[PDB]
Amino acid sequence: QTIQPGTGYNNGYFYSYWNDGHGGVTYTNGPGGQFSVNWSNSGNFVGGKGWQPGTKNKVINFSGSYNPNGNSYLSVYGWSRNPLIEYYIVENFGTYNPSTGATKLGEVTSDGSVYDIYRTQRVNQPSIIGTATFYQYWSVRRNHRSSGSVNTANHFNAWAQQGLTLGTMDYQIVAVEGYFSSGSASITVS
Secondary structure: OOOOOOEEEOOOEEEEEEEOOOOOOOEOOOOOOEEEEEEEEOOOOEEEEEOOOOOOOOOEEEEEEHHHHHHHHHHHHHEEEEEOOOEEEEEEEOOOOOOOEEEEEEEEEOOOOOEEEEEEEEEEEOOEEEOOEEEEEEEEEOOOOOEEEEEEEHHHHHHHHHOOOOEOOOEEEEEEEEEEOOOEEEEEOO
């Protein structure tokens, strides 16, 4: 059904939905690992289904449609603790490539495309453990798509090889993020 921000389990999948309270976003949990999000002149939000906790060798499958009109991403998104890391495996995006101005730390080939690896830092920003300063690891797919399979191990290994280590895994989901834009998406995870 439609719901307001929060987290929980839906049809055997962990889900997380958050927004800054600006309005213009509708998140709906569907059957199984399906979820849909429709937004129009939204604020910042993140929504998706996955696992809690994630694993370092999970093969994530996603199928759907993703139609952003503006700034938005479609990625495998999650966190690690000790060290605190926010990571992204970006499969598609809108008007803004999140790696813009970021430091490139390598390339990895996985699931039909080459990905560029980057590391950024967030200073005194909200996190799963409260306001903090932490790094962000990114894997940005060159060939964009809204369906496919993601072998997380290939990314986590490549990151480690470059010196980008991860700690204990927290949640791991396939999420749609938007930043003051419009769009629609319907994705099924498995």
